[PDB]
Design goal:
By secondary structure, this protein is an alpha+beta fold. The protein has 2 domains: 174 residues, Ricin (A subunit), domain 1, CATH 3.40.420.10; 84 residues, Ricin (A Subunit), domain 2. Helix content is 36%, strand content 21%. It contains 7 helices and 10 strands. A 6-stranded mixed beta sheet has the order 1-4-5-6-7-8, with helices on one face. The protein has a two-stranded antiparallel sheet with strand order 2-3. α4 crosses α5. The structure holds adenine. Adenine (ADE) binds next to β6 and α5. This is Ricin A chain.
Length: 258
């Protein structure tokens, strides 16, 4: 499977930008684009040898971990650190089999009894996304936390918190140019801060926005979708047009009409 590297050590807006662009390049194939917005591969009929991509993260502490992302949804399904690999609890039998194809060389593979969805991760971490700071420092720290989990140095809450950080700075950033933009800002001024309502609502609405766009009438939504601006005020989305500079890729929801 393809591998994309990134390091928090000396990270700049440009190195982060190159990273995200590279990830998107490996996620999509250019075969499916609706209203100028790329669509991820359809899970149905997708060969297993084209199912995942790897993201190898390194930090100033000279530690490295490798996350595994499902190309059909950019979902982080697990990670490897040295001689151990951990996978979130699969949603179905098909996904449980698919993951057996990842890190086939690791001496110890473990599957968590819990899922990797925010609801569960926030419960384990004992904090919501709105209260978990994001930025290069948090990522640098998160990479160390994941790395030391097998040895017992990392507590469950801290592991969950760390996943929440990696997922947003990698998966959500790849999905939304807007979120990638918020992370670039944090890196540029080396300032850490929790995600505002605009970020949170976008993360929560990806599936619905993907469906609305794909089932739209020439781009026009049948029903509007409400998002939130940074100050928390409501923002109504009625068309795919206003989302072009915001959403980088969508999950496949339906076939494109003639
Ligand atoms: N594990 C995960 N990977 C990607 N996006 C997610 N959103 C919530 N959990 C996620």
């Amino acid at each position: 499977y393809p591998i994309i590297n990134f390091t928090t050590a000396g990270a700049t807006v440009q190195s982060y930008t190159n990273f995200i662009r590279a990830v998107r390049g490996r996620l999509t194939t250019g075969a499916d684009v609706r209203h100028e917005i790329p669509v991820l591969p359809n899970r149905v009929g997708l060969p297993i040898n084209q199912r995942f991509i790897l993201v190898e993260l390194s930090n100033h502490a000279e530690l490295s971990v490798t996350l595994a992302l499902d190309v059909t949804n950019a979902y982080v399904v697990g990670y490897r650190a040295g001689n151990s690999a951990y996978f979130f609890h699969p949603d179905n039998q098909e996904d449980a089999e698919a993951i057996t194809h990842l890190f086939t060389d690791v001496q110890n593979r473990y599957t968590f009894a819990f899922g990797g969805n925010y609801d569960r991760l926030e419960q384990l971490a004992g904090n919501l996304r709105e209260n978990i700071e994001l930025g290069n420092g948090p990522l640098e720290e998160a990479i160390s936390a994941l790395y030391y989990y097998s040895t017992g140095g990392t507590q469950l809450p801290t592991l969950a918190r760390s996943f929440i950080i990696c997922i947003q700075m990698i998966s959500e950033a790849a999905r939304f140019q807007y979120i990638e933009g918020e992370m670039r800002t944090r890196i540029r001024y080396n300032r850490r801060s929790a995600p505002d309502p605009s970020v949170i609502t976008l993360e929560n609405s990806w599936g619905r926005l993907s469906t609305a766009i794909q089932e739209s009438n020439q781009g026009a939504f049948a029903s509007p979708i409400q998002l939130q601006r940074r100050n928390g005020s409501k923002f109504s989305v009625y068309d795919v047009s206003i989302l072009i500079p915001i959403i980088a890729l969508m999950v496949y929801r339906c076939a494109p009409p003639p």
